Amino acid sequence: SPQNQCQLNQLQAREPDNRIQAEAGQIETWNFNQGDFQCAGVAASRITIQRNGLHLPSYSNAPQLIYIVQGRGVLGAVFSGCPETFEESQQRQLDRHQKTRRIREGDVVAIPAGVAYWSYNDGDQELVAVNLFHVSSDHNQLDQNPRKFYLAGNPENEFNQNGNNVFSGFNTQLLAQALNVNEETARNLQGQNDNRNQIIQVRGNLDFVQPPRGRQEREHEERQQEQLQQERQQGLEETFCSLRLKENIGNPERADIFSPRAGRISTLNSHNLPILRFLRLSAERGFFYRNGIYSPHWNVNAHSVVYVIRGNARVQVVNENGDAILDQEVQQGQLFIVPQNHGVIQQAGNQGFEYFAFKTEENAFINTLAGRTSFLRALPDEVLANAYQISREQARQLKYNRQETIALSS
């Protein structure tokens, strides 16, 4: 019942449950029709893009946050009415297009609803992204189904239980009139005989106007990478048109919370990425070390939808009745929901625990139940003592025994 849609019996962490193959990669999707995805108002897909693969332009009815789990690419984003400021020099035969952005492992990229983007893998390894759609966004005025509207190709649509793109539904002769192009060129837009699906293979290098990398930025990128592996060991053009879409939230040095034997938390919200103001979304990226505990806590103003990047943790999620509706090891490649206000305790296993959480409110925050910053610490000893039937000595141990804030070292 949409009315009681969050009265959830059990919760499971789940792997994607359908794959779509394309000439140059794959898309896996977790079914959005499940009870817990509908509570959270989220849909999710994971995409892999092989070397020299091109994810075709599309836009969706839901805003999204895309976490780059692996690789290096280019994106791709189109701002309706902004001039093309990436242009070949005259000193029309020349290439020009709007700004193009480097993505890499650790980035989160915000794509507003109705904004079209493409991506390209120009790196050696596969580029893997998780795509989280806020279907419950007020920015989505359609319905609770995620949609992807494709602008090119003939895709197999990843959300649907003479052509498949938006051009393909226009009269071809009208469409050629509007473009001022021959009828055959317009048939090419309609992709009625394109067999490559949504991610296509580019022969030779894709050339576009692209500013150089590094080598000092290469230096910076390379240092980031070895630091993560060492850690797994223990007018208009200037303003609106060039807004920031992405932030690297997986850099170790970018921690907001950090205890060397416990873990790191990096948080992303309007105080970091201005567009999150508009989107009304937050994100978090943690790396808990061996046996690290994520201090138990509740989400005050959001749902948290957690993707396990690496490692495993044991996890309990408790509802208003004290029942642990989720209780399990959660493992790499899975997805689980911590509903708003439910409490949640997480302990890393022996290889650690990395996750990316997508939070369904602007400036999402938690309240902890343990640590230097806990609820228990805000109560008068005697309200503690009376509340729990305990000595004033014990009540002060509750308050001060854990001397860490959110990442608790065991």
Query: Please, which of residues 160-179 interact with Na ion by CB under 5 A?
Result: 171
Q: Which is nearer to Na ion, 50 or 373 (CB)?
A: 373
Q: Which is nearer to Na ion, 228 or 241 (CB)?
A: 241
How far, in Å, CA of 239 to CA of 318, rounded? Answer: 45
Residues numbered 113 to 172 that lie near a copy of itself (CB under 8 A) are: 113-116, 118, 120, 136, 139-145, 147-153, 157, 159-160, 162-171
Q: At residue 294, what are phi and psi to the nearest 5 degrees?
A: -80, 105
CB-based contact 325:356 (threshold 8 Å) = no
Six-digit token string for 88: 């070949």
Q: Where in 116-236 does DSSP place strands (E)? A: 117-121, 127-134, 148-150, 199-201
Q: Which is nearer to Ca ion, 246 or 285 (CB)?
A: 246
Q: Which stretch binds Ca ion (CB under 5 A): 10-18, 51-59, 94-102, 356-364?
A: 94-102
Six-digit token string for 310: 């690496």
Length of the chain as a residue count: 410
How far, in Å, CA of 299 to CA of 305, rounded? Answer: 11
Q: Which one of Na ion, Ca ion, a copy of itself, none is in contact with 246 (Cβ closer than 5 to 8 A by kind)?
A: Ca ion
Residues numbered 342 to 371 that lie near a copy of itself (CB under 8 A) are: 342-343, 345, 347, 360-361, 363-371
How many residues bind a copy of itself (CB under 8 A)? The answer is 213
Q: Which of 244, 271, 277, 392 binds Ca ion (CB under 5 A)?
A: 244
State the amino acid at position 39 in one-letter form.
C
Is residue 183 within the footprint of a copy of itself (CB under 8 A)? no
Residues numbered 369 to 408 that lie near a copy of itself (CB under 8 A) are: 369-373, 375, 377-383, 386-390, 392-394, 396-406, 408
Is residue 252 within the footprint of a copy of itself (CB under 8 A)? yes
CB-based contact 6:339 (threshold 8 Å) = yes
Closest separation between CB of residue 92 and Na ion, Å?
A: 8
Q: Which is nearer to a copy of itself, 159 or 332 (CB)?
A: 159
How far, in Å, CA of 110 to CA of 122, rounded? Answer: 21
| Cβ contacts of 58 within 8 Å, gap of 6 or more | 116, 117, 148, 149, 150, 151, 155, 198
Is residue 271 within the footprint of Ca ion (CB under 5 A)? no
Three-class SS state of 133: strand
Residue 114 exposed, middle or buried by CB count within 10 Å (0-12, 13-18, 19+): middle
Interface mask toward a copy of itself for 289-328; x: CB under 8 A: ----x-xx-xxxxxx----------x-x-xxxxxxx----
Rg (CA), the chain: 23
Q: Which is nearer to Na ion, 7 or 171 (CB)?
A: 171
Q: Which is nearer to Na ion, 116 or 176 (CB)?
A: 176
Q: Which stretch binds Ca ion (CB under 5 A): 41-49, 169-177, 245-253, 341-349?
A: 245-253
Six-digit token string for 124: 């050696």
Is 101 annotated in a binding site? The answer is yes
